[PDB]
Amino acid sequence: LSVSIPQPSPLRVLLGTSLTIPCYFIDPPRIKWSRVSKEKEVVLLVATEGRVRVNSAYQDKVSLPNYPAIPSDATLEVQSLRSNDSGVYRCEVMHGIEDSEATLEVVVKGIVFHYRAISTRYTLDFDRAQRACLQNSAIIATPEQLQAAYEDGFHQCDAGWLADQTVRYPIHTPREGCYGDKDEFPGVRTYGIRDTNETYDVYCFAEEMEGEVFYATSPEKFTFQEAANECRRLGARLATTGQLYLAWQAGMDMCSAGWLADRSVRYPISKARPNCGGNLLGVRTVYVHANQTGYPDPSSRYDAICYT
Ligand SMILES: *[C@@H]1O[C@H](CO)[C@@H](O)[C@H](O)[C@H]1NC(C)=O
Ligand SMILES: *[C@@H]1O[C@H](CO)[C@@H](O)[C@H](O)[C@H]1NC(C)=O
Ligand SMILES: *[C@@H]1O[C@H](CO)[C@@H](O)[C@H](O)[C@H]1NC(C)=O
Numbered sequence: 001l002s003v004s005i006p007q008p009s010p011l012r013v014l015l016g017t018s019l020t021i022p023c024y025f026i027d028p029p030r031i032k033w034s035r036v037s038k039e040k041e042v043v044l045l046v047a048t049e050g051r052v053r054v055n056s057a058y059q060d061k062v063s064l065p066n067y068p069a070i071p072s073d074a075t076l077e078v079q080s081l082r083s084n085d086s087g088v089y090r091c092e093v094m095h096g097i098e099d100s101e102a103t104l105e106v107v108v109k110g111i112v113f114h115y116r117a118i119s120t121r122y123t124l125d126f127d128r129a130q131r132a133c134l135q136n137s138a139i140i141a142t143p144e145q146l147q148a149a150y151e152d153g154f155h156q157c158d159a160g161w162l163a164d165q166t167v168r169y170p171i172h173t174p175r176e177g178c179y180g181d182k183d184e185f186p187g188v189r190t191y192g193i194r195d196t197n198e199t200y201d202v203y204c205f206a207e208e209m210e211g212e213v214f215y216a217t218s219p220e221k222f223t224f225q226e227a228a229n230e231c232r233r234l235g236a237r238l239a240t241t242g243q244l245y246l247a248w249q250a251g252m253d254m255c256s257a258g259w260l261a262d263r264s265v266r267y268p269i270s271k272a273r274p275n276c277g278g279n280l281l282g283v284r285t286v287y288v289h290a291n292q293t294g295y296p297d298p299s300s301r302y303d304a305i306c307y308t
Contacts, residue, residue: 002026003074003093003100014207015110016144019081020065023074023091023102030094031074033062037087044076044089082148083108083249109207112141112149113245114156116201117262119295122159126194129161129202136262137242138204139163143188145205146170150188153271156290159191160201167191167200173287206242209307213239213247215258216304224296227259227304239307241266257294258305265302267292 003025013019025031033044045054050068054061061080066073074091086108092101115132117123124132133140142163146154150170157178159167168190171178180189194200216222216230231238238261239247248254248268255276257265267276269292274285296302 001028001093001095001098001100003091003102005091005102005104007104009105010107011104012107012109013081014145015081015083015108015112015205016142016146016148017081019076019078019085019106021076021078021089021091021104021106023076023093025072025074025093025100027072027093027095029071031064031067032090032092032094033064033074033076034090034092035085035087036090037084044078047074080144080148080151081108082151083111084152110145111206111242111245111249112145112154113138113204113206113241114158114160114201114291115204115241116158116293122200124161124202125199126161126165126196129200132202133204133242135240136204136206137209137240137246138206141203141205143168143190146203147188158201160203161194162203165193165196167194167198168203204242206246209243209246211236211243211308213243213252213254213305213307215256216306221301222259222304223301224259224263224298227302230304231306234306234308236306236308237261239305243307244268244305254305256303258303260305263295263298265294265296267294 005023030048032046035042035044044058044062045052047064047067052064063077065077066075086106088103088105090101090103115136117132130140140163154170155172157171159169161167168188170188172186174184182189222230228238240261244254244260254268269288271285271288274288
């Protein structure tokens, strides 16, 4: 029997959107969809004789849309794409003693990050929240993107605007003053549709980044103006928050503090990368505190985080 996935290998899809992997087989039967992510492989579903049995974790998430209406079409559909769903998907068709397989890499692009232009909380109406997202090399995040970010581990007890004019915030362990509409249950708390002129923070979605982000330093660091002038001296400019988080997502160790474009300094952190300046290999991390952001005096001395 023959199996084919007619799609170029680096299949790129956005965060929170859907995914369709075409898989067609010829049998001169049982279908299995699995996914290898780094070192872990997860069986997504197994179909046979018209019935599909789906992984419990991927319930209402993966499906075979054209099966069994077209019994020779093992096309897979994956909904609500979190950045975890990246990896190499395997479509394997087996009959009796024969079996064939095909693979396809999926790269879920984009990252959802918080923005608050100054240390003052909740200062952006809907329009100016969108403007802040635009000025930080991003768009205003859709609620699906924020849901995927929460499913990936994002948590911040700060209400922020979204694309659908709603104001939400994700939380895994409910805290005092952070329960919202989910009681003491985890989830993405929402305030519903709000008036276009209510002030909150913003949740932005940074999709892609064509240039590169790097640290420009000096023996005495830089004041903010010196950092901007150092970036401009190298034919570059101070990286925005979206560019910073896109570089940090791509694997660049941006944990060290440095001047960003908006006179702010962020310390990106996660459960996988909780340390800075090194790593503690004999220790695993379960919980990690929310991302920290300082709005230092313009005279403070840091590295420059330039983008080119
Ligand atoms: C920090 O922000 C990044 C990007 O917004 C996110 O992926 C990460 O989960 C955040 N960390 C925490 C602990 O919320
Ligand atoms: C990613 O997905 C795998 C398989 O579903 C799961 O075991 C793992 O905990 C997830 N990790 C993150 C960081 O989302
Ligand atoms: C916002 O707009 C509404 C209706 O357009 C108006 O009544 C209200 O005064 C405005 N400001 C605030 C803070 O709600």
